Amino acid sequence: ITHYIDAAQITIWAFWLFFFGLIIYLRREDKREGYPLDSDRTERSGGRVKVVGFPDLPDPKTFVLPHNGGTVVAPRVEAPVAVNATPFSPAPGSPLVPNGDPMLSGFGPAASPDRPKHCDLTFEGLPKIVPMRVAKEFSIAEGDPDPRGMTVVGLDGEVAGTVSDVWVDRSEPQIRYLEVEVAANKKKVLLPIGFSRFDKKARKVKVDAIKAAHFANVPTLSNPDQVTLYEEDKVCAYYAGGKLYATAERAGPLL
Amino acid sequence: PEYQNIFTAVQVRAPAYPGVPLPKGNLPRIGRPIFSYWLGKIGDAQIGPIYLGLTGTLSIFFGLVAISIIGFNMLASVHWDVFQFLKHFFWLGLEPPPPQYGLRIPPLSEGGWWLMAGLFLTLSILLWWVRTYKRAEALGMSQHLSWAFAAAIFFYLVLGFIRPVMMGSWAKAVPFGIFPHLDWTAAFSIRYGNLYYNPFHMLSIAFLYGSALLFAMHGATILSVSRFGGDREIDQITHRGTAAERAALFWRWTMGFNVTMESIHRWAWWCAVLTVITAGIGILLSGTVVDNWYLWAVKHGMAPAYPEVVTAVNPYET
Amino acid sequence: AMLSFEKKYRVRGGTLIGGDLFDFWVGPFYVGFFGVVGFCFTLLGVLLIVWGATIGPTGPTSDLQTYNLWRISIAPPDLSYGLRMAPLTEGGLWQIITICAAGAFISWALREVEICRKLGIGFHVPFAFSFAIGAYLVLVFVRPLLMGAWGHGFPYGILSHLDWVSNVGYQFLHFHYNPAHMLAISFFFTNCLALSMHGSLILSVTNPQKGEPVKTSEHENTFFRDIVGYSIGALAIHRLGLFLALSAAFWSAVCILISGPFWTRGWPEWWNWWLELPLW
Amino acid sequence: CEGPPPGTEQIGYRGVGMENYYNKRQRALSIQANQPVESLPAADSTGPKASEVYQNVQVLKDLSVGEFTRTMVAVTTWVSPKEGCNYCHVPGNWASDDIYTKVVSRRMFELVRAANSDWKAHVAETGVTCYTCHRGNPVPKYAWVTDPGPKYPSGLKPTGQNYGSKTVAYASLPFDPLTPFLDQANEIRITGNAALAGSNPASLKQAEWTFGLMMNISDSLGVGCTFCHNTRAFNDWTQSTPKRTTAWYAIRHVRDINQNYIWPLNDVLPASRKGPYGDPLRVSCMTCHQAVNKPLYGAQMAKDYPGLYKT
Amino acid sequence: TMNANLYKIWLILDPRRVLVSIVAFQIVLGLLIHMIVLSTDLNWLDDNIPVSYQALG
Amino acid sequence: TMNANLYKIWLILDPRRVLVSIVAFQIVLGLLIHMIVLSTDLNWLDDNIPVSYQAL
Amino acid sequence: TMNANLYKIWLILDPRRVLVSIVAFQIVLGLLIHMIVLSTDLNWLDDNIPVSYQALGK
Amino acid sequence: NANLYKIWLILDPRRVLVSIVAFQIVLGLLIHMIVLSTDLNWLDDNIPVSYQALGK
């Protein structure tokens, strides 16, 4: 006989039911960081009103860290952290302007969270990211230049210093930072590989992010032979601030 | 200018990693690892070692038999003439049994080799599935890969096994060959009245496109924050860094919402898996439930209508 | 509203055009100059699509006008109009919507560039999005231009554009044999495998078996070395995924760009250069 | 590789994508390669009929002697210009049928007359001459025989496919669709007429044979599928072009030519005119069309020869 | 003629891997040989011996 | 004609890898040869010798 | 006419890497040449010489 | 030229040998395959006799 309902139509409707359930599942997972939202509705409600949208936040999950590193929970209540900036306009949706010298403000592309003050570890439990002085089993791959001894230049072509060592990932072998002995103050600062272009024939490392004189203020390591997560983010964020702050033209606009 | 983190400019080397130790009962790994400088320009320079126990050994044996049965028949189909085998390679194939044999085991001379290649590739794949499960178990990892692999195996099984059995004939399965399996794809759509109007075909396309959309988005996002260590997603997930924060804000500011460093991989996981889930269902319903997808789409009110600017007299009516 | 960590990133400047004039957010969305411009192109295009649905192909009173979501179709002009502008009711509406879409798409990408400048992040995402835009522009601009009529563009209809794809494909008898098309599909398929592999591995090491700690980079490398004897690496897997997705888009554009402008016969017959080589 | 711009033609409604593309330079050289031989001057149509002047005229009975002679001159240029009259005639005896080419040619006259008079649903008023197929060659360049395909070892049955074959326009589809469909009359339709399964036993392998035939048809006329189909519904006559109706009759026309005109000549044709299976060189779409949508780009040759029509 | 020091082969090839590879090889060979013969005149399942059971219905 | 110092080849080529490769090559070669012969007139399985076993 | 110092070739090329390559090449060339010959009139398997063994059973 | 021997001061003797050996084998295979594709084919030319005919 004939029927309007058929199995293809039944099954496709069943898929939509599954799919929309999946979307709500995924949107719940998406809210394990950064939520509840910082709004002006939560300010005026005296905190009574938490902005979370739909769906609401999931029940917290736990991450068990190896080597007795502790437990991470998600979502989590995070203490508000002051913003080192003042609004360009008091109207909602206005940007803010960094206080003081922008490079040193910790705001905008110079900003970063406060990551943990411990070192990422290898499976065996050693500090993962270390200089080649310490991980003596590492070498430069034949065919490529040794960055040690290369000259570090800033965005304006001025000599910022010399590469004094190379910091490698012991878990998954690669250069993560160059160690730069800064000419101006003889301090040794990290330089992320993400901000480094090699000019191999010149044996020069070019850093477009900052000027030569900006190298004096790269955040410094508490311990010269290892790097904490906290210090990794502070280092990378300082170079990144230069992308917007290091010269006047970088503010924009084009027209 | 800036470093884009596409190629590794300066590779470093260390003695090869033998791998995380596995529990008792796993076999020792085999192979002496080597380094490729050129693989090391785009990714990891180490090749090897590899694990190979009974599951993978049985899998590879089934798989080599299956692949050789295919190639042998291809070479036989140009009468052992190796030059004509190279000339015609993309056209050659191993053809399913004729429809007259139904689901019975067909003769060696006319379809038996296809059924054997199909049986042993299928067993080879099923054993490879177990391999993906066991390698995660030995490392203490969850089974996300084997779940996604099962979804691909489902689609594979529907194409060559489930649907042909449902339809009562190995002749409705897929031939083994490059261009021959493209013929099968086009002929399947023709026979079943235009696969574009199969709604699970439409969904499967949405998810295949979405996989490229999502990996372009995610791939590009991570490289742009790799300057902040964003490629190290384990510690960005447990200890959110400015990499994970800047990534979410790029997307939040672009399109109004965002996910997390962990949950993008869930979006990615489901998008890819649903590509082959919907594909299996679409093929599973073709011939078994719906014989003409266009007329099925007409029936449910979906097919567009156009002004008539061409038309043809049906000579079967006259 | 803002993410609980967002306020410290909402910095002034980094615009390409506009400066202080449009430098503000609207809820989560950043606007800026290309936000304003893109919004106008988008709302116009969407409203003109709905107007085309309202009047249909032959007027709102005909039986062909429909708001059925699968059946709504706004079509390009007849090929006889060449590279000229057709009347609004004879495909010109499609032509204006196309320009809105291109303007909407390009404005979206440039807005993304301004966002990257604010966040001090790389420009990979707008660069990658440019490949999708390029493919759209190959479809509605370059390929129609090389063949001499905007009417070679595809219609804007959820199912009607599949009819366009179908009939354009079968103009070449057996479109599956397009070499750039085969290559592009290989990239589309390989991308999907790679995406499922990547998603699975990250979820499986951060969500290990009960009682297990979070797994390590060493687990990730070991895991695929154990299965396939090779691990590309956690950075390189993101390199690979971007390469596969962009390659799929690029060869898509190539495969349709050569279908008409650079090849007019069946696609299987293209392979006769191989068959006719003096080796066999 | 080809260079833009191509020639283009719109076939269907705007945006449906039914469009034809061709290379302008190849079209110009094809037009040069499909020139029609200029028709002979008209002859006096008076005097006695050929039926009463000559001794063994069985087909061209009602032509005047002038129109009959004119026809013999024409067929010589169309079929055997290098050899001349004696390609079909015993020297010194025009009436004798004791040479195989004359016996064949007599049936060819009936073939053409049947085509020009009875198959206008196909050949319209344009019609065909000997030249349409022969092109100045006794043996048509684009005749065909059943194709045995590549050699197999004795313990493996040939598949009839999965091979690079020009006959299906270099697809790996079943590479001999001519024998089952343009000689024999196997069913070409496979698309179902109901949405839901239950009443269509056609098979995927039948779809591949049909698809292979359509490559050959398309390739023989130099067109894409959209010349005759809207490919969102290949089976739907209401969305097809009138060329599909024409193609339907042409398939039956081709079947009539091979079964009733060519095949009965097999025993009198020399072995050189036969394929490995003993079958005679015979007729497909390519034989007349020769990669043009109309033979000779639609040149009207038959109309200047009254002897090329029935009664 | 077997060699008296043949046992020293297990000083060369790993006994466990040999065992694993033989088991794997023989499972494949067993399935492969059964299937080849089923695709020939020797087939014992569809030979209607001792009877055809599809005809009793 | 063989050399008296031919045993020194095991100072050059690893005995372990050579043995594994030999049995792998011989097993694959033997499968291949059985395949070739079955696909020819020499087929001993489908030759109906001593009898055809497919009864009506 | 070979050179007296030709043995010095094993000072330049690794004898081990050379021996494995020759074995692999010779195996493949042997397989390749056998197949080419089988594809021609020279076929010694399907030539029904001395007799055709399938006729014996059909 | 008298100083041509210095070419081995510029180009690695070991890779050049390997490249020459690799190139010559492929070329030899290529040329045989080309000639066997033409009228010059000496294998399927039924010369001195057709052996398949000998078996019919």
Ligand SMILES: CCCCCCCCCCCCCCCCCC(=O)OC[C@H](COP(=O)([O-])OCC(O)COP(=O)([O-])OC[C@@H](COC(=O)CCCCCCCCCCCCCCCCC)OC(=O)CCCCCCCCCCCCCCCCC)OC(=O)CCCCCCCCCCCCCCCCC
């Ligand atoms: C013929 C078939 C041939 C197949 C051949 C295959 C060959 C292999 C054969 C062997 C197979 C063995 C299978 C596994 C064995 C045991 C594995 C194991 O370790 O188990 C313990 C395992 C681990 O325990 P655990 O403590 O959770 O550990 C998790 C980790 O800590 C870490 O976990 P986590 O934190 O990552 O979370 C896990 C994850 C869980 O995800 C998975 O693990 C499974 C993923 C799915 C795979 C299958 C695809 C499903 C396709 C559905 C679409 C079909 C269309 C029709 C729709 C019908 C549904 C209505 O969480 C989610 O993703 C949540 C998903 C929510 C589902 C969607 C949400 C909406 C549901 C409906 C909403 C309400 C509807 C109305 C709403 C109204 C308002 C809108 O137990 C689980 O809880 C996970 C279950 C997964 C295993 C079984 C399912 C996957 C494997 C089979 C897939 C087969 C695909 C074929 C589909 C065919 C077409 C339909």
Ligand code: BCL
């Ligand atoms: C009509 C064509 C002829 C024929 C013509 C030839 C000719 C001509 C030759 C062969 C040779 C060989 N043939 Mg044949 N061959 C025929 C039919 C067959 C059939 C078959 C099922 O019908 C088989 C399985 C074989 C098999 C073989 C191999 C034994 C050998 C090549 C091995 C190789 O490449 O080593 C490569 C591996 C290495 C170089 C590594 C080092 C060698 C090791 C140390 C020794 C291995 C065993 C050795 C090959 C023994 C050869 C002994 C006899 C002379 C056969 N022939 C038919 C009847 N065959 C070749 C041969 O005899 O070579 C000496 C050869 O020149």
Ligand code: BCL
């Ligand atoms: C007209 C058709 C002729 C014919 C015409 C020719 C001609 C002409 C030539 C060959 C050449 C070759 N032919 Mg032929 N050939 C025919 C039939 C055959 C058949 C066959 C199954 O019918 C086979 C297998 C071969 C095989 C071969 C090789 C022996 C040789 C290519 C070696 C090479 O590439 O070295 C490349 C590798 C290297 C240079 C590496 C360095 C040295 C190596 C390590 C030592 C190799 C030893 C060498 C092969 C010894 C053989 C010399 C003999 C005089 C044959 N010929 C027919 C009968 N053939 C070539 C030749 O004789 O070369 C001297 C050549 O120029």
Ligand SMILES: CC[C@H]1c2cc3[nH]c4c(c3C)C(=O)[C@H](C(=O)OC)c4c3nc(cc4[nH]c(cc(n2)[C@@H]1C)c(C(C)=O)c4C)[C@@H](C)[C@@H]3CCC(=O)OC/C=C(/C)CCC[C@H](C)CCC[C@H](C)CCCC(C)C
């Ligand atoms: C989300 C859907 C997508 C998807 C998912 C998917 N596929 C998967 C997985 C997942 C999650 C796996 O875990 C699995 C895998 O292991 O990937 C790393 C797999 C896989 N997907 C594969 C392919 C694949 N996936 C495809 C598609 C897709 N996969 C999707 C689009 C396709 C397409 C597009 O058609 C292909 C071709 C394989 C790479 C792998 C399954 C491998 C497998 O089953 O292997 C056993 C089979 C064999 C034939 C083994 C043969 C052995 C080889 C010939 C090696 C020979 C070795 C020998 C020792 C050499 C000795 C010689 C000496 C001389 C040295």
Ligand SMILES: CC[C@H]1c2cc3[nH]c4c(c3C)C(=O)[C@H](C(=O)OC)c4c3nc(cc4[nH]c(cc(n2)[C@@H]1C)c(C(C)=O)c4C)[C@@H](C)[C@@H]3CCC(=O)OC/C=C(\C)CCC[C@H](C)CCC[C@H](C)CCCC(C)C
């Ligand atoms: C290049 C590899 C792949 C890719 C990557 C890519 N796409 C991207 C990005 C990247 C990197 C973004 O950053 C960007 C984004 O922000 O995503 C969330 C985007 C995006 N890719 C999108 C879509 C998408 N990408 C696709 C494909 C692909 N994108 C690739 C295969 C497709 C396919 C295959 O069809 C679509 C559907 C959007 C989600 C988003 C861009 C959003 C945007 O530009 O918003 C402004 C425009 C509107 C809101 C609508 C404009 C309306 C028009 C004015 C009128 C409509 C005209 C239209 C032509 C009609 C079409 C009708 C019918 C066809 C149904």
Ligand SMILES: COC(C)(C)C/C=C/C(C)=C/C=C/C(C)=C/C=C/C(C)=C/C=C\C=C(C)\C=C\C=C(C)\C=C\C=C(C)\C=C\CC(C)(C)OC
């Ligand atoms: C001579 O060659 C040598 C030996 C040198 C090696 C060379 C090999 C080569 C070149 C091989 C080339 C292979 C190629 C090009 C293969 C291409 C394959 C493609 C594109 C395949 C695509 C799709 C195929 C599919 C989807 C097939 C699916 C089939 C299935 C699932 C069949 C299952 C059958 C089963 C489970 C049978 C069971 C038997 C039962 C139990 C029913 O018995 C009664």
Ligand SMILES: [Ca+2]
């Ligand atoms: Ca086929």
Ligand SMILES: [Ca+2]
């Ligand atoms: Ca029995």
Ligand SMILES: [Ca+2]
């Ligand atoms: Ca026997």
Ligand SMILES: [Ca+2]
């Ligand atoms: Ca013999």
Ligand SMILES: [Ca+2]
């Ligand atoms: Ca010869």
Ligand SMILES: [Fe+3]
């Ligand atoms: Fe990732």
